[PDB]
């Protein structure tokens, strides 16, 4: 219940700004269907079906000490939130409906009050809220009205909306999973084994014709807009270079001659032959990680493969 927003150049959270929130409700993704009805047949063909948009709603109110200040506070809200600038929203929850604790009415152990006139139930460090999950959402704002209930309390009804892709982009790459350097950004929503360096954590293999990958993301990383990015030290010289993959298509690189120690950066629908001067004419096919086991099969025992990606959720 804070509605964190990471904008291009800053980080903001509402309750820091005197802005309590009632709740956050996140719709699912609007499935746009594409059916076609045959003329006299009791059944209609599916041309397609496709996720579109994940409309968020967040009603937030605010109290202040005096009626004038309402105006300022409201303006702050707009200047703080209503941003066409695609932002990264992060949801927050509490772990408990906190109450005031027992005290002693002996002219001592009195109660605290926040900067806003409320009772601080958060006595200890471990009371305040948490990033409930290690993911974000690429988000933009839609129109709000501000009904002023009595006093200094005024409500607002934010209506956020997904920007590019209706998915729960996981923050942090898969290499931070590999190297346990960055802390946070890994919630139990992702069923992740502790065996760092073990299987289903590793995306850095060496000297293999074929290997195994566990894509922890329920949603499939077929869309190029996702940050799926591979880089391979090819290991062995060749004239052509095929690699296959399951839950995806076959990939070739024919017609250009390579060398062993040369490396390929295989970005989404894009191929850096040696990091620059992209040679992407050969078999334009992009790979697709669906969920769980995504087994790959090279053909000449690359001396290194490693690939970072982002986990996406539905």
């Amino acid at each position: 219940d804070i509605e964190l927003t990471k904008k291009d150049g800053t980080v903001i959270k509402l309750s820091e700004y005197g802005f309590i929130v009632n709740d956050i409700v996140i719709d699912s993704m609007q499935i746009n269907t594409k059916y076609q009805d045959k003329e006299n047949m009791n059944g209609r063909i599916l041309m397609g079906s496709n996720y579109i948009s994940r409309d968020i709603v967040v009603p937030c109110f605010c109290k202040v000490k005096n009626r004038s200040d309402i105006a300022y506070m409201r303006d702050m809200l707009y200047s703080l939130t209503t941003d066409i600038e695609p932002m990264y929203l992060r949801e927050i929850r509490r772990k408990e409906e906190l109450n005031y604790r027992f005290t002693q009415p002996t002219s001592d152990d009195y109660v605290k009050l926040d900067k806003n006139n409320f009772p601080d139930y958060e006595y200890s460090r471990h009371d305040q809220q948490i990033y409930v999950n290690g993911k974000q959402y690429k988000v933009i704002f839609n129109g709000v009205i501000n009904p002023k209930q009595k006093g200094n309390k005024v409500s607002f009804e934010l209506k956020f909306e997904t920007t590019e892709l209706p998915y729960g982009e996981s923050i942090g790459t898969s290499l931070e999973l590999e190297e346990n350097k960055k802390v946070g950004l890994w919630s139990f929503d992702f069923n992740i084994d502790w065996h760092a360096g073990g299987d289903k954590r590793k995306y850095t293999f060496e000297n293999l014709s074929k290997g195994t990958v566990y894509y922890h993301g329920s949603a499939p990383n077929d869309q190029f807009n996702m940050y799926k990015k591979i880089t391979i030290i090819l290991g062995e010289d060749t004239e052509s270079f095929v690699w296959n993959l399951t839950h995806a298509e076959i990939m070739k690189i024919e017609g250009i001659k390579l060398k062993a120690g040369d490396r390929i950066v295989y970005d989404s629908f894009r191929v850096y032959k040696n990091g620059v001067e992209i040679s992407t004419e050969t078999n334009i096919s992009q790979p697709k990680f669906k969920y769980g086991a995504n087994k790959f099969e090279f053909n000449q025992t690359v001396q290194k493969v490693q690939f970072d990606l982002k986990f996406y959720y539905k």
């Binding site: 594409k34 076609q36 045959k38 063909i45 041309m47 397609g48």
Partner: protein, 177 residues
């Protein structure tokens, strides 16, 4: 079609009239005759003639096609192929040929829908090509003058008849000598 270039109607050159099998119930009609021709033999004069006939009772089937991917994938339509259509409650089981196809492909080269036309490409497109041919043949010329046209054509034609008159005079004057 065998009269010489300078005659134009003294109908030498394989005078004939043909007809198709359906004629006998419909009866006496006829199209623009094969007037223009420098072709000697008669084998030609029946083939081209029946072709002028059978090209005209026109049938354009501008149906719509909808691709099934999970099922029936082996139907990538390509123009200039044979196909066996059959519509119940229409009186139709014959086979035809594609003459137009219209594909769309969003991404990954997956098809969304197809449109096709059979036999003759359309009535529609025939009209439109007629219009555009008129509008481009015109404006490629230079003799056109919208304010009182036909000066450019009548000047020419009267010049032609005048030189023919002078040639008649020359003919008489030479036959004199």
């Amino acid at each position: 079609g065998n009269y010489s270039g300078e005659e134009t109607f003294e109908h030498a050159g394989l005078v004939m009239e043909a007809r198709s099998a359906l004629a006998e119930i419909y009866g006496d009609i006829h199209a623009e005759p094969f007037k223009d021709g420098k072709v000697t033999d008669q084998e030609t004069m029946d083939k081209e003639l029946q072709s002028r006939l059978k090209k005209s009772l026109k049938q354009s089937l501008s149906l719509d096609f909808l691709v099934l991917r999970e099922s029936y994938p082996e139907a990538d339509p390509q123009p200039g192929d044979i196909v066996q259509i059959k519509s119940t409650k229409l009186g139709l089981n014959d086979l035809v040929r594609i003459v137009q196809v219209k594909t769309i492909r969003g991404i990954n080269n997956v098809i969304v829908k197809q449109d096709v036309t059979l036999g003759e490409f359309n009535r529609e497109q025939r009209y439109m090509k007629k219009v555009n041919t008129a509008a481009n043949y015109v404006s490629g010329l230079n003799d056109v003058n919208l304010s009182n046209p036909s000066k450019a054509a009548e000047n020419l034609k009267s010049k032609v008849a005048s030189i023919a008159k002078s040639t008649l005079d020359l003919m008489s004057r030479t036959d004199l000598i």
